Amino acid sequence: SFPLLVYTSDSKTFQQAIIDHIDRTGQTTFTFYVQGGVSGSPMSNSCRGLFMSDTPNTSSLHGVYNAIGTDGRNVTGSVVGSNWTSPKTSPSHKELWTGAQSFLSTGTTKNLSDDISNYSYVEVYTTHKTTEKTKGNDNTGTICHKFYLDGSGTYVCSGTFVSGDRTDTKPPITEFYRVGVSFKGSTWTLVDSAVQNSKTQYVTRIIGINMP
Amino acid sequence: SFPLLVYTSDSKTFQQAIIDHIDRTGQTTFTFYVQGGVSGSPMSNSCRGLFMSDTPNTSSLHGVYNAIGTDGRNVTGSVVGSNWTSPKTSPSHKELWTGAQSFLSTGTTKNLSDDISNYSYVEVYTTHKTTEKTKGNDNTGTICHKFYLDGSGTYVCSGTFVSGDRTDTKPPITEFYRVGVSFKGSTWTLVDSAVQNSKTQYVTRIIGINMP
Amino acid sequence: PLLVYTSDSKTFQQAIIDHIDRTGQTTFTFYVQGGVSGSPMSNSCRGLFMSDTPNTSSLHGVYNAIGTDGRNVTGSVVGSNWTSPKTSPSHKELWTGAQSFLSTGTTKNLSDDISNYSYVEVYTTHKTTEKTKGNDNTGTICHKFYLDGSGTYVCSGTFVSGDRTDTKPPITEFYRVGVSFKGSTWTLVDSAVQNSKTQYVTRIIGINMP
Ligand code: NA
């Protein structure tokens, strides 16, 4: 078979290209190539994809499409009685590092499983023990700090915890924490930290994120 | 290739429709339409998509599907023997604004690239300079604040930073920050803020999010 | 039509190249067994490859694959530069409602077992101590966790509020709510509120990032 090919030099929207293909061929399910720059395309860069429908009625078209771009981004969309919905772009991720680096291990570098330049955002996870126990537990779970990668020398994960069981004599206590990290190529470094108690705090996971 | 059509009126689950279809037709790769409200459908709204199996053996079915909603929501799923996995529903996003609005620019309105009513969640990104430098630098990177859009007049991005290098006698210092933002149609406003140094802090990105 | 097994001792990328070279097919479906070097995912998958031409020494193409657990990966090759595979996340809303921070020791149901997720987003909805420019609302704030087996997932933060005057700076407050999960349930375990206004947990979304 012959997938639908849509060029900018055709001077035809994506939507009219799909209509014309279905008029000409009667196909309801088929693949397609759309050159980057085609008006109404699921995306800006070139893409390929799959159009799915069951009735080739181009006056009231009902169908969906699933397209992938040159950077791997996934875009899905629909047409409902010949009205085209806004294409939906998915995010993606890759787990780059997991382990347990004490906040006290400043100036230490570890590897990422891919280069940080393949990501626009990142999630850095930290795992804490609060100054005091609250209902017998000082553990916090593992907390996400999400950043946009803006070229900073330091990505700063800084926050606070309340902990302790209130008595009439002693309210809960408050504490501040920080860990700063940096990225370079396929590596990351724990640059700085501040801890307000004697317990060990860790960086435990780094996840690369794309939101194309 | 015959399409599978599944209506609520059929009193048949999505999974049984699939089984029945492959038993009736012998076809192991086909497209489908599943009316909104069908039991065990990949999503609650109406969808269309592709089922792909290894063989027409419905007693040990091995296969995948992609289903896309009337609003372009994307779901993938699988079958292993008589065990259907839960549907994996994808999120989507759109960048609505990027720039660099100072926290001190309260009352100022800027444009979004899409109407906020098209999103259920939103990420607001802020970019800071802490009061003191830490290991040679006061930048924080660009920090995400994610909200569910609940109709509030103000979405509040408020946190703390630790900054400065500890000496033998002087600890790091702490600061608080706040920026509050609002959304209306295809616009946003920087409503209020609190900064505790003379350095400039910015709102830099707004990303609309759907988690259908 | 393309089947790749760990026993073939070839990478996903070389298997695609071989398939195109052998058959001249540029669009085809595939099965890749869990463990194949360079596969879009670590578990077994099935999907669709689409390429521009059969020039395998400068391949331009894309793929969409689905794993045995339903995970979805998409990717591309541009002039035989294979770009990092783009793994989608997934989610399920597990609970929505309005549970006061003061309702400690209370349990509610989730729509699915927490063991089916690796991450969770817990949403909290606040009223700050003071009104700021006429309003003490915060919106509904996400706290995302990796589910590490902790007995408490601690949502804790601060708010500045109040209108600055000559006399009276803005005020600061700390808050905390701790939650736990067991099977298809969650419990509001502990809290700290520094005013008399009602604070809520409002949403719990289960998240997978395979
Ligand atoms: Na996706």
Task: Please give the full DSSP string across B57-106, using - where no structure is assigned.
Answer: -GGGEEEEEEEEETT--EEEEEEEETEEPPPEEPPEEEEEEEEEEETT-T
Strands B4-6 and B29-34: parallel
Whether the CB of A189 is below 8 Å from some CB of chain B: the reply is no
The full set of domain ranges for chain B reads: 1-89, 90-212
Q: Name residue B144's beta-bridge partners.
A: B125
The two structure tokens encoding residue A176: 């501040």
Euclidean distance between CA atoms A34 and A11, whole angstroms: 12
Which residue in A has a C-alpha nearest to residue C145's C-alpha? A143
Q: Alpha helices of A9-164 — where are they, by DSSP H?
A: 14-25
Q: List all residues of chain A from 94 to 133 with a beta carbon under 8 Å from chain B.
A: 121
The two structure tokens encoding residue B94: 């759109």
Query: Experimental method used, please?
Result: X-ray
What is Dmax (Cα atoms) for chain C? 82
Residue C139 to residue B159, Cβ atoms within 8 A: no
Q: Compute the count of residue pairs across chains B and C with CB atoms less than 8 Å apart.
A: 130
DSSP letter (8 states) at residue A195:
E
Which candidate from B68, B127, B143 shows the least CB-CB separation from A64?
A: B68
Beta-sheet strands, E only, within A118-170: 121-134, 137-148, 155-163
SS3 state of residue A55: coil
Euclidean distance between CA atoms C119 and B27, whole angstroms: 38
Backbone φ and ψ of B85, nearest 5°: -65, 160
CA distance readout (Å), B103 to A160, B152, B198, B204, C24: 22, 19, 11, 10, 59
CA C168 to chain centre: 42
Which candidate from B48, B74, B165 shows the least CB-CB separation from A90?
A: B74
Beta-carbon-side half-sphere exposure of residue A75 (alpha carbons within 13 Å)? 24
Q: What is the Å distance from ligand 1's center to A43 Cα?
A: 15
Q: What resolution in angstrom units was achieved for this structure?
A: 1.8
Number of separate helices (H) and strands (E) present in chain A: 1, 15
Q: Name residue C161's beta-bridge partners.
A: C171
Q: What is the Å distance from ligand 1's center to B89 Cα?
A: 8
Contacting chains of C (3 CB pairs or more, <8 Å) are A, B
The two structure tokens encoding residue B201: 């802090």
Which candidate from C74, C84, C89 shows the least CB-CB separation from A114?
A: C84
Q: What is the Å distance from ligand 1's center to C92 Cα?
A: 14
Contact assessment for residue B70 and residue B45, using Cβ atoms and an 8 Å cutoff: yes
Contacting chains of B (3 CB pairs or more, <8 Å) are A, C
SS3 state of residue A155: strand
Q: Name residue A92's beta-bridge partners.
A: A210
CA quadruple B93, A126, C148, A208: dihedral sign = positive
Residue A53 to residue B73, Cβ atoms within 8 A: no
Whether the CB of C24 is below 8 Å from some CB of chain B: the reply is no
Q: What is the Å distance from ligand 1's center to C128 Cα?
A: 36
CA distance readout (Å), C96 to A205, C124, C143: 28, 11, 15
Q: Which of A93, A125, A143, A163 to mutate to test the interface with C (most CBs of C within 10 A)?
A: A143
The two structure tokens encoding residue B141: 């990177």
Q: Which of A54, A144, A206 to mutate to test the interface with B (most CBs of B within 10 A)?
A: A54
End-to-end CA distance of chain A: 32
Gap from A190 CA to chain B (nearest CA, Å): 11
Q: Cα angle at C91 between B207 and C146, to 5 degrees?
A: 90
Q: Cα angle at C42 between C37 and C43, to 5 degrees?
A: 120
- DSSP for C194-207, written as a single string: SSSS--EEEEEEEE
Backbone φ and ψ of A16, nearest 5°: -75, -35
Q: Which helix (H) or strand (E) holds C20?
A: helix C12-23
Whether the CB of B44 is below 8 Å from some CB of chain A: the reply is no
Whether the CB of C144 is below 8 Å from some CB of chain B: the reply is yes
CA distance readout (Å), A68 to A7, A143, C27: 16, 32, 14
Listed residue (A162, A184, A176, C131) closest to B131, CA to CA:
A176
